[PDB]
């Protein structure tokens, strides 16, 4: 069980208040031993002008998940910031909700690397991301 | 101009209606020969839980600009999709607005590559992004 800082899904979801996370309708849906998951709507809040899920929404869902997972891997007075994000958009999404699933690749003392995969409502992989973070303080 | 479609600023801003672009308060501020710029507020819509600009918001700004640049490289029967995104978060921002500036790196007939730099109000570079797009059809 990797987490060093322990939050419930309720506490996690309350962190989203007055942030972009809540603004995109992102809701954390699962906290496992080594996995964090959230759902995100595919609607006007996350669409691009031609009816698809905006690639920037999948990206934001990935930085959200990687950064909060990173947060739960630190101790009080420590902050986690995203430093490097990349994403590959494999398949379009036109409707439903997507699920982001975040797992650790590398858990360092000052740097972390997180994998976030985004799946559509049929369970198909639509985006693979990797987020590098810095642990500060 | 490099663009295939000769659009106007008013036209670009009209595409944002009912999409993530409007939801994040992104506004196109400059459409030049070879450059597309937009501004984005740093507020609760684009914040992360600890008061900073969410890195996913810079990413979303970058994918917005590069894909709309790619759209302007399409013919009528065609569409644009973002395929690869990467971003480096150099500096945090907490208030005011940031400005994204998009310029072409490579304009192929299948694929394109765009640079998007995001600046704070003092003109300090806060994020550097690169976006691959695909023209389909
Ligand atoms: C087309 C790509 C790039 C390469 O193709 P590939 O390597 O050969 O992959 P495959 O073709 O093998 O499988 C892919 C599926 O595409 C399907 N299909 C295509 N056309 C049609 C059609 N007419 N009818 C039916 N189906 C069609 C295929 O059949 C296939 O479906 P399937 O699995 O059932 O066989 C593909 O990887 C992709 O779509 N990535 C997601 C990009 C993305 O969503 N980026 C984010 C949004 S855009 C940026 C943005 O946010 C933005 C912001 C502001 C403004 C503007 C924008
Ligand atoms: C800390 C990094 C990674 C390295 O350090 P470094 O390269 O050695 O840094 P320096 O040696 O140059 O010295 C510091 C400089 O930075 C400035 N500054 C410093 N402190 C503050 C401050 N408190 N307040 C304001 N400004 C501050 C100083 O002015 C100073 O510059 P200078 O001396 O020239 O005046 C740095 O590159 C960075 O902050 N990147 C942006 C990361 C980012 O924002 N990612 C996105 C958000 S987090 C993820 C997320 O979205 C998320 C989502 C959901 C949940 C959770 C999260």
Q: Does any ligand 1 atom lie closer than 6 A to the CB of residue B69?
A: no
**Exposed, middle or buried by CB within 10 Å (0-12, 13-18, 19+), for B110?**
exposed
Question: How far away is chain A from the Cα of B23, in angstroms, using its nearest Cα?
Answer: 6
Closest listed residue to residue B55, CA positions, set A22, A126, A59, A44 = A59
- Whole-angstrom CA distances from B123 to B43, B98, B117 are 18, 9, 11
Closest listed residue to residue A20, CA positions, set B99, B61, B128 = B61
Obtained via which technique?
Answer: X-ray
Question: Which residues of B does the annotation mark as catalytic?
Answer: 63
Q: Which residues, in sequence order, are CB contacts of A118 under 8 Å at separation 6+?
A: A58, A61, A62, A98, A99, A100, A101, A125, A126, A127, A128, A129
A83 touches chain B (CB under 8 A): yes
Structure tokens at B13: 């801003």
* Break-preceding residues in chain B (C–N over 2.5 Å): none
Q: What angle do CA B101, B21, B53 make, to 5 degrees?
A: 65
Question: Which residues of A does the annotation mark as catalytic?
Answer: 63
Question: What sections of A72-124 are H helices per DSSP?
Answer: none
**Exposed, middle or buried by CB within 10 Å (0-12, 13-18, 19+), for B124?**
exposed
Q: Do the Cβ atoms of A79 and B50 come closer than 8 Å?
A: yes
A5 touches chain B (CB under 8 A): no
* Break-preceding residues in chain A (C–N over 2.5 Å): none
A110 touches chain B (CB under 8 A): no
Reported resolution, Å: 1.9
Q: Do B89 and A81 touch (CB under 8 A)?
A: yes
Give CA–CA dist B133/A6, Å, rounded. 40
Q: Do the Cβ atoms of B36 and B102 come closer than 8 Å?
A: yes
Give CA–CA dist B27/B99, Å, rounded. 10
Closest listed residue to residue B54, CA positions, set A29, A68, A6 = A68
Give CA–CA dist A48/B71, Å, rounded. 12
Which residue among A19, A59, A63 sits closest to B63, beta carbon to beta carbon?
A59
Rounded to the nearest angstrom, the distance between the alpha carbon of B110 and the centre of ligand 1 is 13
- Whole-angstrom CA distances from A5 to A1, A74, A107, A119, B91 are 11, 6, 14, 27, 26
Rounded to the nearest angstrom, the distance between the alpha carbon of A55 and the centre of ligand 1 is 12
Helix axes A55-71, B55-71, angle to 10 degrees: 160
Domains of chain B, each with CATH number or no CATH? 1-137 (3.10.129.10)
Q: Which residues, in sequence order, are CB contacts of B17 under 8 Å at separation 6+?
A: none
B130 touches chain A (CB under 8 A): no
Question: How far away is chain B from the Cα of A133, in angstroms, using its nearest Cα?
Answer: 10
Which residue among B19, B46, B64 sits closest to A44, beta carbon to beta carbon?
B19
């Amino acid at each position: 069980m990797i987490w060093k800082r322990h939050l419930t899904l309720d506490e996690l979801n309350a962190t989203s208040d007055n942030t972009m996370v809540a603004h995109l309708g992102i809701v954390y849906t699962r906290l496992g031993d080594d996995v964090l998951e959230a759902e995100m709507p595919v609607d006007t809040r996350t669409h691009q002008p031609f009816g698809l899920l905006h690639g920037g929404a999948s990206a934001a869902l990935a930085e959200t998940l990687g950064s909060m997972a990173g947060f739960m891997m630190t101790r009080d007075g420590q902050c986690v910031v995203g430093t490097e994000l990349n994403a590959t958009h494999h398949r379009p999404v036109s409707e439903g909700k997507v699920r982001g699933v975040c797992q650790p690749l590398h858990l360092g003392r000052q740097n972390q690397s997180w994998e976030i995969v985004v799946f559509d409502e049929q369970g198909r992989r639509c985006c693979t991301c990797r987020l590098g973070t810095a642990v500060l303080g």
